[PDB]
Every structure is written in C-alpha cells, then in structure tokens.
Amino acid sequence: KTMKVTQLKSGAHRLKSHKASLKGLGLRRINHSVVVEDTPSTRGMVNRVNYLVKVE
Amino acid sequence: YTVVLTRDKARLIEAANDRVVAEFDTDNAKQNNMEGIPFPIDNNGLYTTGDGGSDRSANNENSYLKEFFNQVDKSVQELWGEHKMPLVIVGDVRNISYYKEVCDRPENIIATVSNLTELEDGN
Amino acid sequence: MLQPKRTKFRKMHKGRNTGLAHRGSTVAFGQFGLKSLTRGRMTARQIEAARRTITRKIKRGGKIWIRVFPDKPISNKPLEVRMGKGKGPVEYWVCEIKPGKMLYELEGISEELAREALTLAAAKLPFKTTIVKRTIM
Amino acid sequence: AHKKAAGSSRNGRDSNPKMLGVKIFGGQAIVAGNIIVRQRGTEFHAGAGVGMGRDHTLFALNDGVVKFATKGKFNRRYVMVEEA
C-alpha cells in the first residue's frame, strides 16, 4: 500500500537529518506531493518531519 | 571614632577620652564581615598607580579623591552601624571638606581637626 | 554568619538553579514553616538577619530550625579590575533556594506569635514566601 | 583596584588528550590485532579471544565478533571475541 505526502513548510532551514528525511521521502519543494509506500520505514521519515509535511 | 584622612590613605581609631581603644587594623576582629574596604584603607586607585583612563590632562584628581573619600566613608559607616558613636574627622582642610560633602551621615560628625601632624605614620 | 568550617575546594563554578525543591519542602522538625515560592540565592547575611528577627519575636520560649546552610562560595571582582587574570576571591556564602524549600521552622509557641515571627523574617529575605503547617502526608 | 583582591593563584596547566575509550563495540566484526579498548587499569578485563597490553590495552587475539559481558564474582566487565 501507498500514501500521499505533501510538503507544507520550507525545508530550507531545518536540521540536516530533517532535510535528509525530506529527501528520502522524495519531497523537493513546498506543496510538492509524492506517492510513497506506507511502510514503517517511510512512516518514520514522515514522523521525523511531521511538523512540515502532511499525509493525505 | 577618629577618621584620619590623607590623599593616600585612611585610618580609623576608636577612642575614649584621652586614650585609644582600638586602631582598626587587620587584627581588630571587628572588620571580619566588612563588605567595604577594611582599615587602613590605602588609596590604590587607578590614577595613583597609572593603569586607569583619562590621564593627567583630564584633571580628574579631585573627582577621584572625592570618590576615594566616599569609599572611606562607606567603610566608616559600615563599622559605625554596629557600634554607633560620633566621629571626629582629622586631616587636611581640603580632605575634611571633600569628606564632608560625601559623608552618608554628616550630622554624626562632632568635630573636624585640620592641624594634626604626621597623619600617615603617626601614633 | 554561617559558613562551612572548611571546604574541599576554595572556589566554585557558577552552576544553575533549576527545578523545584522536592527535598526540603516539608516541615520536618518544627510545627510551623516559612517556605519559599521563588528561587534564588540566600546569603548568609540574610540568614543571620532573619534568624535574629525570629529569635527576638519568639523570646526564648520556642525552638527554631534553620533549614538552609550557605555552603556555596561566591567570588567577586573588586572595582577597577579588568576582565580575566584569574577568578576573583571569595567574598560571601550563599545557599541555593528552589521554589518549595523550607527555610525556617518554629515549634513550641502559639500559632499567632509564630506567624508574626515568620512574617518578620520574610520581610528580610529575597524571596516570595508562604507560611506552611506540618501535615503528615 | 580597591580591595586589592586581584590575588594570583596560578594554575593554568593541563595535559594533552590520551584518546582512551572503547574503540570497537559489541557485535562488530574484528580481526586479530585490532585494539578494542584503550584504558587506564582494567576497566574492562580480557575474556576469551582478547589479550591485554602493558598499557592495559585490549586487543583481539583472533578474528570474529566483539562481545561485552559482566561475568565472575567481582561483577567485572569483560570483553571477548566470539568466533562468529
């Protein structure tokens, strides 16, 4: 199964590992929405940056 | 009390009539909890040694000496706040007057003697 | 003027005062306590003034406990000395007070003349305080 | 300089770092000769597969995986190399 993740806030001034969680999710800019498999490993990346992304 | 002032130092002598009770040295053991400078207070100000600011051209000698006598008065008042009794100010006329316009309780002063000799080394 | 008789070391790092008094927040020996609601440093001079003003008001018919002991040396730099060139000398001693700590306990006296002495002491202290009873839990 | 309290208590010396500590942790592959712990005294003791230097350095005597344990009646910390 997959899920939709959208970037809502800038990733530009965040921690290095938070920028890397955005990169590992595949999110590149504000309002960008990607489809990614809904696994615990991708859910952990969403949880690392959950303040700046939202899951539809 | 007898507060002795010079431009380089202050002494404090406790007295009863003709005799000196104590002279307030480091061995007095009433200066132990002093927060101000204890007696004898040497004037080790910045202008007396040379580090400072505002070298001689500023003509701040009077202001520096006024503040030194203000700190001397602080020490005298600290020692008086436990054993209140009047003070006699001894020293040059200029020093006595600089002290007078700086003293915290100027109405406690009973006398000012300006013709006492050998104020630094004297008995 | 309380002070440790002798210390392991002369000088101390500033440290931080954080957190509540989970220890020493109970009236342990007396029947009536004055406890601090704020934090800060309690100078040995403040402790001595407060003890004097409680002792005078209770007049040798009651017992006092001082729960604070000043064991932290505080260094000071004299006037007209630049920054650096070594840590200043110790000038006075404080106790670290957290919100909640009992400072004074009284026992063996009426509630009214204990509250008066405790209010008198609070007036000399750098803390917001409250008067507390001894409960059992 | 009033109160003259500028008292010189001169102590500004310190030694160079020694870089002690655990070099290889538990479950890591290790080859013989690899230093595991640098230490003063036996904060860790040498169990099977690890040797002890004149400096109390612990090193792998043979290949395998590093294992940490608390063993013995002194409840000592032990480092072993398991053949795995």
Next chain:
Amino acid sequence: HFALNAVDRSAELQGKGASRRLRKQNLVPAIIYGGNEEPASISIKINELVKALEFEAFFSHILTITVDGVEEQAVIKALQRHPAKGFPMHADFQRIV
C-alpha cells in the same frame, strides 16, 4: 469522612502528558494496589481529596473508594504534593485484606 469517590483512569489518561491534562481537568491521579489483586488506576476530584486530607483520621483509618461501581477498602499509603503550591498531585492507596 472515610469514603471517597473515584473514576477509572484509562490507559490513555496515563503518562506525563495525559497526567498533566488530567490535573488541568481538576482530577488527581491515584493508584490502588496491594491486597490480593492487580493495581487499579483511578482519578479523584481534587476538591474532594483536599477536603478528605483536611481530616486527620483519614491518614490512619480504613478508607472506602467507590469507583463508579466496584468498591475497594484501602489505606492511603502515599501522597504526592506540589513542592511549592502544596496541592495534592498523586495518591497511593493499599487494599486492606
């Protein structure tokens, strides 16, 4: 005087954040343990608990907790207060056999 009313404290009301929320709703967390059975998490209204703590035999007598249903005969074992404010923060009751 020796009777108090409680409400079951669920597993979603447990922990630091949920405890702070529970005290913001004017409830005191408490635990009943001992006796024979497993510990039970309960909540007591703070005003009721303060009034009960006012009485001095409360700390030495057999108390009865009624958790909206089941009954528990207990003894107050521990009481956690705020270090500065002084109000009760937690209560520990032990079942009597």
Next chain:
RNA sequence: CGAAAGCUAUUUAGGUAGCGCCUCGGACGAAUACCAUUGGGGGUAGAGCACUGUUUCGGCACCGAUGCAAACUCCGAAUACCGAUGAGUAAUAUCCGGGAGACACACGGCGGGUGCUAACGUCCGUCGUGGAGAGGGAAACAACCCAGACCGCCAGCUAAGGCCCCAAAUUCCUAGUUAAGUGGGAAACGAGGUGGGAAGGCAUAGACAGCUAGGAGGUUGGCUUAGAAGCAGCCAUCCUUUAAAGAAAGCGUAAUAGCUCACUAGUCGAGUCGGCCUGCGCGGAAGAUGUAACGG
C-alpha cells in the same frame, strides 16, 4: 559551481605552511545519506548520600531524622556516537590528480566556564541566520520570524504577519474579562478594585453593623522598678457575682485618673463574616532639544 574566518605549527599571533572546507578532471559505483528494527559501551540531565567532604536537630564518635557538592557517586536517562539487517527515496560516499581561496568572523538559540546567570562582554561546545542572500513581516532594524530572486506577465493560492483610517483585507460571529488608555516599560511590598472557584463560621432559639444599658468584686495578681495599679518588662492568667466582662485588645498617666474595646442584655429585622485559590486591573512609577514608553 561555490567556501573559510577552524585544527596543528610557527621570533607565531592582522604573515605563512600541512590538514579541513571550494572548484575542475579522471577512477570507482552504492561502499553514502535518511528511516524502521536491532547489537553495544558510557557516567552527563535528573537524582542520591553508599564513598570523599560539608549541614542542621534530637538521643547517647555512633544511632535516628534532615539538607548540599565542578575536581563526591550506591544510581542514572533522553539524545549523541560505533555496528548490523532491511525497504524506498536521492545530482551519494570514496580515491588519484590540476587550480584555489581561507586560517579578524558576528548575532540569535541551547549547554557551560569567566563576569555581576552585567554588557551589542569574553572563552569553548552545538544549531540556525548573516557573512556570501534579495523578497514579505518585526514602524525604521546584517544576525529575529516566514521564505531561498533564471527572465517576462495589469493571472491565481497561500506563509509569517495581518484585516477602523493612514494602508491591502472583518467597524466579522459567539462567550466572557478590563475601566486602568491597563492594553501601549519597571520590583519588593501595600490596598475594602473587580470577576470566578473550592470550602468554612454565624443566623427568625434574631446573625453582621449601628444605637441604648452594663463592662464588675478579690485586686494596685505576684515580681520588678524611681513608678509598674488591665495596658515598660518578666512569671501566672485564678476565683467570685453573673446575662456578661480579659489578671485586658487599644488610647491615655510619672504612676494614678480617664476614654474605649472584647463580652452580655435591649432595639432592629435577613442574610451576613472571615481566610484560601485563580483571572484581569490599582498604587509603588523622578531627567534632562519636543508630545516622545501603541509608528501615527
């Protein structure tokens, strides 16, 4: 494409050099990063007195209560760091070589030393921004907040921040608080501001206040003191007639005297009294060219 103001050394300290960081070329190809699960060691935050010290009280150095510590630890996280396994995402990591620049950094956070838990202070660690970064907000304002400018558009949605007028957008809706222009500087402390909360005391056997009458005898309690009479201070605080009245809560006297109060009865008729907790207010609150401490 894109730094650095670091480490090490230096007759070095504003110079230089190796390393770190930038660029270009080649080699290599996931060896890299993020996350999930998982294997480790630790002595920090917290905590605590088991050691080293330090602290208080009681009993009799030891016992029992009770505190504290960078150079104390019977304990002890979160993180971080070192490994493993596994997905997906990704302009990865590493090595060899050509060319550098840089080795004055600054602020805002966080953890500290120093200082005064002073400094737009200083010294480290660690993050972000500036440096080398425009745009929007914070009146104005490198370093704060939001956000990273390839160029053009008289299109749309939003962020921080905003929506009465300057000035784009609510004189929007609901429930309440404030009366201080508080909002739109400032503490201990003071006060009968006002709103809310959890409880109490008293009351038609008449509460609270007011008003009328009493408020007494032993007795000037004893001691002290020059005095010492309810009322300087110290030790008691007892009895009697009672409806009630203190060996007195104030004023007053040199001490007395005197005037009150507590308290009781009468009058009056319905609620009232005092503490605690929370919200928002008040006083405390004085400076120099001009209001001048909401930008107006």
Next chain:
RNA sequence: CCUCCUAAAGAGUAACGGAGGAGUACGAAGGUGCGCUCAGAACGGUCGGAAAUCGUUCAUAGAGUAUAAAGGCAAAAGCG
C-alpha cells in the same frame, strides 16, 4: 610534559578558568617459580605509655602500590 575538572554519558574541545605533579628512581624496585595478605578496633600481657614488640577476636582493603592524581589491582598489579 603528566593527572583531575571545565568537557554538554564515544573521541576531541578554549580562557591571564579551578586544583595538583614532572625534567626522576631501580641490576632489583626487572624475569620466573613458589609462598603470603593489609589498615584499624577491642581484650590479655615485664619495663611499655595514646601508640613499639607478643597473643586472641572481628576486619574486601576503611591498607599498600618508589613518586602527583585518576583509573586499577585477590589469578592480587600489594608483601616475602
């Protein structure tokens, strides 16, 4: 140059920050084999005591470790 702390539980990490050491010693104080266990406290005992040596009973180290501190040390690394 060494030890502790600052140093933020891996390493490292500055200050004219807080405290202390070194510029040696040893042919045994090195190697090995074998053997041993300390400080204290109390009781008894000639001179002899607070404390000498002797005996007993407790004693995981409250000792020692050439030397500062830290870490360690019973298989003692301590003592023959």
Next chain:
RNA sequence: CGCUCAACGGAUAAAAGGUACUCUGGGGAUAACAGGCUGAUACCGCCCAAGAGUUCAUAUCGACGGCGGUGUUUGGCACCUCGAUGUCGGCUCAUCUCAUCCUAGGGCUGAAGCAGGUCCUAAGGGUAUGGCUGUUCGCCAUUUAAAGAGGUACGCGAGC
C-alpha cells in the same frame, strides 16, 4: 655519546638598553577624550522595624536585612572615530530637567508665638562679591529672600 637548544618544531656558534631630538609604513584589528552597551559600584527612592527619641518604632532618625529607579560617581567592555571627533579651568553666550535653594500653596509635628523640622504640590521668575590656588572643587571673609542639584561632546577654542 655531547643541548634548562626550558621561548622546550629547537632563526646564529656568537647579542643589552635609550629616544621628550626623533622618523617611516600601518590600525579605531588596539589604548588615552568624548559617544554607545552595562550598571557591579555610586547617587536617589521604597519595604521591614531592632532601636534612639524622658514616655513613645514610625515628630524626627532608622541597626540587621530586602526591593527598585536614575545614568549620576568609580568602573567593566572595545561597537564608532587613528587618510586627526583639540585636553582641564576661566570668559562670553546659553538651553533643558526636577531629585526645589528662595519666593507660592499644603498635611504632620516632640506645631504656644517667633522660628523651624519632615513630607506633599509646584520649574513662573530669581538664585552674590571677594582672598588663596591653573583649578573645577574646597577653605575662608562679607553679604543675600536664596547663594539649588544636575543634563547639554564632564554645553560652548572654525566665539575668546
């Protein structure tokens, strides 16, 4: 094997000072003035009330302690200025603050009156001349209703 080459990555085998007679290249990377930040200290105010005051804490004063305000002393920092921001004092000419020296209105008083003391309101005007010393100040003489405390680059040298 020979270095306290100890300034310990060790410049030479071999080495001190003066300069107000000075000079060059630079720095506001770094001091002295003045500004700025801070406010320990200082000054001013407030809180408590042991006490002093014949009695009597609070007329007046306020021990031990606590809390602010100012920028105002002595300092701390090194942000501005070193391709130059002239120091102290006087003279001249000022301008503002109020923490008020006089004059004005008040409360309290240990206010009989006269004089005061303390505090509140109040900044409209006013607020000396000499001796000494470069002084600012200070002492002193003689006055005055009074002879204020301060800020203004410790106001003012392209005005002296």
Next chain:
RNA sequence: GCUGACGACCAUAGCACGAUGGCACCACCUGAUCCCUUCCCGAACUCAGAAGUGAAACAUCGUCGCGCCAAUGGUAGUGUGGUUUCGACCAUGUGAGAGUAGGUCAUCGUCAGCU
C-alpha cells in the same frame, strides 16, 4: 537419598540464628622414622597412618532479623516542533532516581563413590 571434584551463574546465590549428618565421603585427629617443611615453631606445608569425634569446620534443612532484588502509578529530566514572563508551558516521542506494594534462605551441568 547423600557425599566429593570441576564448572555455569555471581546475593532472589549473601549474612545471621537454630536443627540434622559419620555406614561411604569429608573434616578434624595420631606420630614426626622417612620425603618435604619453619627467617623460630609438624601452626601452615609434607609424609606415614587409623585409637577417637562430628566439638570446630563443612554439607543439608528451616526462617524474613539484616542484606539483596523489586513493581504499578506518579514525579524529575529529555529528542523534535511550537510558545514563553526565561521559571517554564503545550504537541509528540521517551522516561528515571528515590520511595511504596511485593519477592528471596537460589537455580542448573559433567564425572565419580555409598545407599
């Protein structure tokens, strides 16, 4: 069923108190010729032995007096994001130490011997 040896483990295994054990085993025990011991000493070590005793020790069993172990709940701290009056607070994840209830007089393995 018990004893001994060697281990695992290293207090829930320890300490203390009491009880049981001598046919095997173990320990004391006897003697010091011999081997070997003592800076003196057959104490320890060593040898040669069984007249005696389970006294000591040791082993086993019992108990909660100490020790040790130890929840649940709460509190403290804390990573990330936000806010702040700088104390803290909120969202989320994590989560002690102390203390309390409670638990504990261990649990196993190889080999030999007597029954």
